[PDB]
Amino acid sequence: KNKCVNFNFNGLTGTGVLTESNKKFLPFQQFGRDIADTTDAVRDPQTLEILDITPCSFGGVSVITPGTNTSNQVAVLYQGVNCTEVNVFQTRAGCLIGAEHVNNSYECDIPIGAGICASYQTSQSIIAYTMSLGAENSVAYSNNSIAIPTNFTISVTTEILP
């Protein structure tokens, strides 16, 4: 129990994590099924019990690295799964190994998820930080107050379309 195994129960072969289930299946009920008609739970022919089948192999593998001319440092990101195999940190996207966590917020460089972005900075290494939404500008407001521009500048914007 509590481990990914290859199990053959009552002739049903499959791989999955075996855990004790709180569901109570009727006596005539052997194996359960979910909405997708995959086995939901199993019952041992010897000692009658209901075991929840949790499939194995969850989460992806992503590489967070700067340009080649920058450095060869890499930060492994496991998306959709916590830290299992294994600078070991966890996020809402999943386990991120190889990147330091900086509380200070900066401008997003390499996007990760859940508002977290990575960059290569200062003895330099990949760091993770919360995406900064920009500097706070508080405009003073009063009934008698107004701001008249005293100067102007001519700007040229470059826009491209295919």
């Binding site: 997708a36 995959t38 996207a93 990760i112 939404l133 500008n137 405009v139």
Partner: protein
């Protein structure tokens, strides 16, 4: 605005936990490798729609501690710091009125990627844009923020619609009752009537029917004796199983490509509305447009953006 991000794995989906079955997939070439990039491109486009719409500026504008609106009550659309998650009173009803299901499909090999932009940061976008329009008027997006009295901001907005500003200063007292009462009707209509948000609900249900149906294809035999890979592998010989596996993969490929083809088509329809949402932000919300019935019936004056799950809601003030 944004569509639910779903990343499907053609390696696990086509052949579940099967080495021999997966071997036949290599004979098809990039079909699996190609479908992975098609879905990845849709996930990337989902993030670009929120950046080109939600946040039109690089700075954050917050309201001053002492708020004098000249007789108008913005508390409904203003963010409430008392709540754990900062949002406007109107955004609260949108989150509840807009609705495990993913656990079943998540184990089948379909992974839902989280959005790069959280709903919390999205709420702060409408707070900055809505706060800049009140204090900075329409000049916060065209350059340096101009501090202008809100009482004098609507004076010119009437000049653009062909009404002298003299009517605002005199009738501004009666406009407080008509404007405030109009905002209250919106909060009661969304809470009592849940059919106004059906526009966004149809987008979520559109992907739900596509995900559930794609998972139900595994139960179909697709011409094979059985729809289970372990059953055919443990019964028919390797050469005979390949004949049945061919109908399983061929049937699943047609079902997988049909899903990817629909996502690309649905993604195009979402991008069409994304440009409109980005256009209404600058013309309706950010600025003022003389165009008629784009911002809603009547002469347009000001627009207040509001965040909504997998979308955006606009509050337009018309004359």
């Amino acid at each position: 605005v944004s569509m639910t991000k779903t990343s499907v794995d053609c390696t696990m989906y086509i052949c579940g936990d099967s080495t021999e079955c997966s071997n036949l997939l290599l004979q098809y070439g990039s079909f699996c490798t190609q479908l992975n990039r098609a879905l990845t491109g849709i996930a990337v486009e989902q993030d670009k729609n929120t950046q080109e719409v939600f946040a039109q500026v690089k700075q954050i504008y917050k309201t001053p501690p002492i708020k004098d609106f000249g007789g108008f009550n913005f508390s409904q659309i203003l963010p409430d710091p008392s709540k754990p998650s900062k949002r406007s009173f109107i955004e609260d009803l949108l989150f509840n009125k807009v609705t495990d299901l993913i656990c079943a499909q998540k184990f089948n090999g379909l992974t839902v990627l989280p959005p790069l932009l959280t709903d919390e940061m999205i709420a702060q976008y409408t707070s900055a844009l809505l706060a800049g329009t009140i204090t900075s008027g329409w000049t916060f997006g065209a350059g340096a923020a101009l501090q202008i009295p809100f009482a004098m901001q609507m004076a010119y907005r009437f000049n653009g619609i062909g009404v002298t500003q003299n009517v605002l200063y005199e009738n501004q007292k009666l406009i407080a009752n008509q404007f405030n009462s109009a905002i209250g009707k919106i909060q009661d209509s969304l809470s009592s009537t849940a059919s106004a948000l059906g526009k966004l609900q149809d987008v979520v249900n559109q992907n739900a029917q596509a995900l559930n149906t794609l998972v139900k294809q595994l139960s179909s035999n697709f011409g094979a004796i059985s729809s289970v890979l372990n059953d055919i592998l443990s019964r028919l010989d390797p050469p005979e199983a390949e004949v049945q596996i061919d109908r399983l993969i061929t049937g699943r490929l047609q079902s997988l490509q049909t899903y990817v083809t629909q996502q690309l088509i649905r993604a195009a329809e979402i991008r069409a509305s994304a440009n409109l949402a980005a256009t209404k932000m600058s013309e309706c919300v950010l600025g003022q447009s003389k165009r008629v019935d784009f911002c809603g019936k009547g002469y347009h004056l000001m627009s207040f953006p509001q965040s909504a799950p997998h979308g955006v809601v606009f509050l337009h003030v018309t004359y």
